[PDB]
Amino acid sequence: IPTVIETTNRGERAYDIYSRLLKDRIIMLGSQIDDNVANSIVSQLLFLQAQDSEKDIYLYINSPGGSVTAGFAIYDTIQHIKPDVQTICIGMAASMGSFLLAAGAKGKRFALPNAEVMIHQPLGGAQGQATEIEIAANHILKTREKLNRILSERTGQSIEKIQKDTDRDNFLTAEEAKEYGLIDEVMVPE
Amino acid sequence: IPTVIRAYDIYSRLLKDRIIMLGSQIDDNVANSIVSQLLFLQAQDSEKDIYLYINSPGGSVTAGFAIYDTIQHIKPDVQTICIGMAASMGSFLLAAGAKGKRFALPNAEVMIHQPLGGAQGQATEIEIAANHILKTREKLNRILSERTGQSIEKIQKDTDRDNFLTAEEAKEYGLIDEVMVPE
Amino acid sequence: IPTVIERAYDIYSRLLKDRIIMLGSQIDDNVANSIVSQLLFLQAQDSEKDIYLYINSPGGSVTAGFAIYDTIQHIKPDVQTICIGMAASMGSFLLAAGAKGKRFALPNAEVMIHQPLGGAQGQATEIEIAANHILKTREKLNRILSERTGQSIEKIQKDTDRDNFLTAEEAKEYGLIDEVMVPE
Amino acid sequence: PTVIEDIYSRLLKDRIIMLGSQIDDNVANSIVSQLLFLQAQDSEKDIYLYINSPGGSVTAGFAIYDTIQHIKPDVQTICIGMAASMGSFLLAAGAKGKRFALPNAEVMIHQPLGGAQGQATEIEIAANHILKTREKLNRILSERTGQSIEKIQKDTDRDNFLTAEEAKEYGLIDEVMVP
Amino acid sequence: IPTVIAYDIYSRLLKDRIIMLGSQIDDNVANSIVSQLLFLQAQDSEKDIYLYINSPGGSVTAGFAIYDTIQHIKPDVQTICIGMAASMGSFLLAAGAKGKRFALPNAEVMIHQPLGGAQGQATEIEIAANHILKTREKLNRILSERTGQSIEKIQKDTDRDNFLTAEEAKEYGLIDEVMVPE
Amino acid sequence: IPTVIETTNRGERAYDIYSRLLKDRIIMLGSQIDDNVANSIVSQLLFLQAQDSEKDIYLYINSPGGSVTAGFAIYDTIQHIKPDVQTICIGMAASMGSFLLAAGAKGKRFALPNAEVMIHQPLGGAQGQATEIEIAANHILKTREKLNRILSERTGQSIEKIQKDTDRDNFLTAEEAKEYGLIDEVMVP
Amino acid sequence: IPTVIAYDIYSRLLKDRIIMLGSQIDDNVANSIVSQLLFLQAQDSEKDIYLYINSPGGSVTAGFAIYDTIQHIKPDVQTICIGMAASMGSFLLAAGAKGKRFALPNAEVMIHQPLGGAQGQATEIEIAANHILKTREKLNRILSERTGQSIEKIQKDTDRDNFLTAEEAKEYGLIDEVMVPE
Amino acid sequence: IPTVIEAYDIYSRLLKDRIIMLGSQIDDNVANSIVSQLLFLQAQDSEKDIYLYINSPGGSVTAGFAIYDTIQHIKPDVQTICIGMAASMGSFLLAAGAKGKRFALPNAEVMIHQPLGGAQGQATEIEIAANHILKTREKLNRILSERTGQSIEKIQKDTDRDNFLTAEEAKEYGLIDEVMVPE
Amino acid sequence: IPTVIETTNRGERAYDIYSRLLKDRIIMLGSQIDDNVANSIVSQLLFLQAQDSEKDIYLYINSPGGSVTAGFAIYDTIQHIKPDVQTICIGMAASMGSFLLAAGAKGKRFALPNAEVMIHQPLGGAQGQATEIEIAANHILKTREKLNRILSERTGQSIEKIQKDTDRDNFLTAEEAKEYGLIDEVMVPE
Amino acid sequence: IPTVIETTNRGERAYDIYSRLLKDRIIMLGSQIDDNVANSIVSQLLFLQAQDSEKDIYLYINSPGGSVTAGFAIYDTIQHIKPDVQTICIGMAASMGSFLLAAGAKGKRFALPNAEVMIHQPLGGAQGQATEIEIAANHILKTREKLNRILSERTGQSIEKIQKDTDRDNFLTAEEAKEYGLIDEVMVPE
Amino acid sequence: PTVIEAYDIYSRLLKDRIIMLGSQIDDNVANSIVSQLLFLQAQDSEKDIYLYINSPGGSVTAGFAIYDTIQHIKPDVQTICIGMAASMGSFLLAAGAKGKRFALPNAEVMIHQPLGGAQGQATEIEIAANHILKTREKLNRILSERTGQSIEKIQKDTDRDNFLTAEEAKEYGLIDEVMVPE
């Protein structure tokens, strides 16, 4: 992980590349979603909301998704904080990554032209007694209905369509995700 | 595994007396063996009673239903005797013996509980697995209610956690008809 | 496995002398090789007596199942099929493959139908080749099952998407069996 | 070794049964089958059970106990090396006056071994079952030995190693075989 | 494996001059098939042998041992495809007597180039590559003789796993007839 | 990794060798391409655009390639930023490594005389239900069409030629990669 | 492994003085083959023995055990390469009786120097190298006797793995003729 | 292992001819089997010779002395024939044969070495284990000295490292009496 | 790896021993050659060429060799830069290390009196369909021809002689490496 | 490994205990010898010659030996260097460690009273074809001849005597090592 | 943990001249100990050094390293047993300056003969045995001189594991007094 040196007209200082990007208000979501990752993202979004409650935040998303509860943590923090978070799919947004994509400010969800979006129903596991498997199934089905309903709200597709389309793994190009409504536009190559 | 001289093993010699031994987990290969023996003993004499000895930790539910269905389909009555342990699929086979002819030895144990399973993968697949194991539990509770005479609600309540019955409690529950007193 | 007699059989060989075939295991090429050898031996013994196939399997290899299917269709004697416990995957296909009017289930056996399972690795064109092969395999299965059951290919296509469990009476209403063996 | 007219099948003709291994459901199934066979052969001649066992499953040992009490022929028990708690339990289960040890045989009595994992309710159910199993074993030992149930409760708390003379004084065996 | 009386099922079928190839072709399998073929030639040199094939193939030199045996012996070896014939299984399917190579209607055939590994010093990788290429040339030349297809067509068509139905295998000339049910 | 201590009008700083090269605007890709490497390389490219939109960036490639999505992340970051990225093959550019080599600016893609370029179709796999295997095959076939189309744009070869030339592991010398159009020029000392 | 009645297939072949060598050569395989050779000499001192070879070879001292047994006994041993004869397998192939070394047309032969290893002290690696070199000398000398090739030529040709067709093995003098199918 | 019916295995039919095949490493289970075969062949006839065909890397020294002491205890002469290799105790059992009746085949090889061992734990235990392996090497060197006619010092020096001997060198050493020339 | 600090002038500069040697334009190549090592060596060469385009680099070689593409990366970098690179074999130069040893500037290849040089043909693996084994063999054979051409130019032996000598492992002393032309002289101690 | 803080008119400065001993020109050869350890030792010897070329270096040996080519990279003690390297055995000098002990300057090789020295022939191995085993055997034997020749010239024992005495593991007390000539004096307890 | 003054706790203890031997004795810790003892000798050649010992012992050559360095440096090294001193830990405990070996009141001291191992040839096992026996004689002799106890008594008592209290270690002479709490 490279270090960047920058002049400040009051001194000179060394940052990690991610910490300099964090000074620009850029958050890197570049790995699977787990507890440690969600804790980091939440702390970064809360620090940045504390520093400046008007300026946008830039969540960069390149992840295979991950834990649904940690994704809901990042979602709820993004909806709680005052400043708008702008989601940019850099190459890959799958599972909760494609949800954290669709979870950004309206008009401010972007993808690079060759980024991949995958939407699919959640994965889980159940073991032991029949009643324990019943409890786990009912919980994962409520989780899927919560995800589908948030997606229907943020995407404008009906819940029946999101149910049908997430049944198997649906791979979207950025143009397909723009026509779906998971993103607002595809970034024109400056 | 000793031999009786013709050169039977001890189980083949007890099969000559129409005795079948269950002494293992119930799986497809054990159920396939027991079903084969039951069809053989039906072909050897369709009248004389079969004697099924159970010391099993339970096992596969579809293999136990295989045995159950074969016991119900053959003409000869199957006397079931519990020797050491009868755990839920063993207890289900114990109940499946002929009425008036289900026995336990005085220190045998019975255990009744709901079926075990699992699921992985998509929410729809976990749904289908849960639905299947719930319908399997309903089918088990229904057959148990018919065999014991206990209500489905009572069996549902009693099977929720592992319920360990003595042979006298298994007679009171109606899982067996008699306790075999030593001669 | 208990012996039964100097004519010392094992229990399955004594059942084979009564023309009983026990399919109580996963279907691999080894069990398919044994089942096909039993079918050919029993055909050689007598071409007009019925065969009784007893099925309790999770299925297995599709090519081993088709080996068994092709053998029971090819040989002259009728094969009665009797589901004893589970008939999943190719086990349900071999259940449905029995002679008409001679496909049975015990009163609470269960039948499960699903699409075939496979995998692929390596280059994109190799994955394409494996996908084309497994889709042709699924089409072959759905076609044969549609002929054995009378159910349309579209319906079997819809119903085999996920694991579809059937009771014996649903399997009869699906036409996978002809009747349920009501106990004496 | 094979004897033409195996060594255990030849000894079974003499109504000799060898329990030279851990008690598990396979061993119990085999011993029960041999006991039912020897009952079907001759309902009145004695059966000799030679015991050299580290014990094993409690329910598999109760299978044997209940079979040797159920059948009509007397089962003599003869301890030649090891009788560990389930093996000493089956030793106690021999016919009265017909329980033997060889002079250097080792008898051990101890309480059941057990595990439970998972919910507090499930650990409670397993603890209750193991404590009721210990009560069943202690009661049956009290009847077979004649020792107080409180004495057996105290003595089985830790692993107790008895000599053959000590097992005779305890009442687990009736004689030590003089050579 | 059931007993017939004290044959096993395969030993009884061996009396009808049936051979079952129901497994991967390895040295032990080739050794057995070759011993069976030689025994059946000794029992009667004028009477057909029936070879039933359900195998994924395997070792090329074991398959060539079987091929050379069925070509050296006097009787006609009928080949019947039962489920799969892949790799040297489809080669041994093609090696049966002309007019006596069969598949059942739902069997399938796969033809492809052989599989190889070479860990090496560069001269040793070269030697292994030259050997595997001569092995492919041998296989393609014999397939061309057995099918009547050109060695260029067989080269082009074995380049990736080519799954053939029994109809496609009859069109290719790998079998002479599809055995309709009796 | 060694350190270099470098002086200015204000300072001593102790740089790692890669941080010193990054100060020059030099990015090293000396690794498999995975999401971590994609994120790092993208962040560096963004910081280099941040400091000066006009000056050329240099990307130095010694990679067996890797993930197609991570490589397309790098590719799209190269195509978004204003500054020209020079791509230099230092020893190996295989898989997405040669794709990222072809991603450099027209006239500013280089290889060293003994470098090698390899082009192939992407590797993947599939498991489970026939419908799942079909969906995976469809996805990786669309990914190969994407790669082939972008390579046709970078190199000027027809899609049918790139389709044939990537069917198996095709190894190019730097002079062959120059004739193929994957690079513009071979670096001479 | 089919039965024939109560023989197995290999024991029924052994009744006809057929020995099958369809595996790697280790001490158990050697001890089996040597016992069969001794029993065949015990039953009839004049009738030929037929040794079918399909082997990757293996242990060198096991191969020399087989070699010295087939050279010690009175009856001539016909060797038939089928499939593959590598390493000590092709050495035993050449050890057949003159005019009685055969291969099948698509069989193939490999000749190469012996493989070994050494560990520990310089003195121990020296001792092991000297022994593997004396073993290679012995193998080359015997091959020169049985093929009539020069020992310098065999030393050169065995340096790397050398795969020979049945015709090339005939020209090399490892076999006397190919058994062409009738 | 192939079968011959007059229903033997090939080794048991060779046992009819008094042929013992030592084709495997010498552990206690092999020594037990060979000593049993020797005692049986002594029972069947005490005057006819026994043939021991040796192809082994050797093994346990106590299993080697088990076989050696059985060969020397039984009355009938044991002809030893090296077929492939005789390393370690295999060369020792090769030398154990009857005088004038130790043979090798022309390309067989003999290896004579010092016995391997090990020690772990306390200095006193390592000392005891070393002293035992030294007395084992002494015993081996003495038996080789008397059976080969070489002196203790020569064998001690020559067995210090792995000494491979050709059959001609083993005849010069006195481990074999003749090389079996082909019939 | 010990730190060294005490210095003339401001004397602030604490180095690890390798950074202190890098101050003297000494590069160490004392490990297996891989892309990580090759990228490090290349970066150090580029840095030293930027700092001074005229002073010799000194490259100390104690490596069993390794990856051939990584070695060619190092080779092409030492050939591209303007400053001469002196190569010193301090203990071993096997395979690709002996190649980089021979790649030093003329008159500037050295070995210590007891260093050993081993030349051999490249090592390879190919798991394959027969066309894939053909492809891998053809590539490893082209790689050997490239290596032999370069060695022949750097060494003055004919490419047929290097073909003959590299077929097995050839272990050279420093005197034999001097006679061969892989090094220019053996460093006499003084 | 603990830190030392030292006080100077220039400031207060941290050292790990080994960097503080390196200030005093003390080199700890405290491990098995591998290429990385040899690299470290060679780099230290070079730095210490750079700072002062006529001031003794002290090499402290507690090593189970190691790689022979790494030990030969150390064997010189970079005998190129002008400074005299003293060698002290602290507890163990196993064959390459005792070789490096004997490499010290004459009159400046020491061993603490209760130190032990071991000499033996080099360990190795060979696998593969007969000619590859031959190549490896010829190499290991020539390496042993080289080690015996160096030990002969540095101890004054005949090559025949070192050949006989290194055949098996030979353990020498400090006094026996002085009689052999691997060291000049046993350190008296001060 | 850190102490801002910015030491870690062990570096601050070393500032006092306190060395902790609280770990397995391996070559790495022996090197650390030696280094530290020579630095403390440089810092002041008269002030005592304190070695605090809580170790199961370890390598005998690493212990003899620490020993011979301790008994060379000018200042008196004080040894304190904190909780355990076993094998070479008890040896380094006894190695402290006379009058200045201490134990805490319920620390334990264990003395036993060294462990070793031998493998391979009889003469290799003889050499490993002879070496471990000379190592034991060396240890016994040093302990005899540092405790005032006969070599026969140490030989007899170190045969098995001997566990000493601080009072028993004081009577043995391995320590000079037990530190009463202040």
Numbering used by the authors:
A (entry chain Pd), I (entry chain Pb), J (entry chain Pa): 4 to 193
B (entry chain Pn): 4 to 8, 16 to 193
C (entry chain Pm): 4 to 8, 15 to 193
D (entry chain Po): 5 to 9, 19 to 192
E (entry chain Pl), G (entry chain Pi): 4 to 8, 17 to 193
F (entry chain Pc): 4 to 192
H (entry chain Ph): 4 to 9, 17 to 193
K (entry chain Pg): 5 to 9, 17 to 193
How does the study describe this entry?
Bacterial AAA+ proteases are composed of a AAA+ partner (e.g., ClpC) and an associated peptidase (e.g., ClpP). They represent ATP-fuelled and self-compartmentalized proteolytic machines that are crucial for stress resistance and virulence. ClpC requires cooperation with adaptor proteins such as MecA for activation and complex formation with ClpP. Here, we present the cryo-EM structure of the MecA/ClpC/ClpP complex from the major pathogen Staphylococcus aureus.
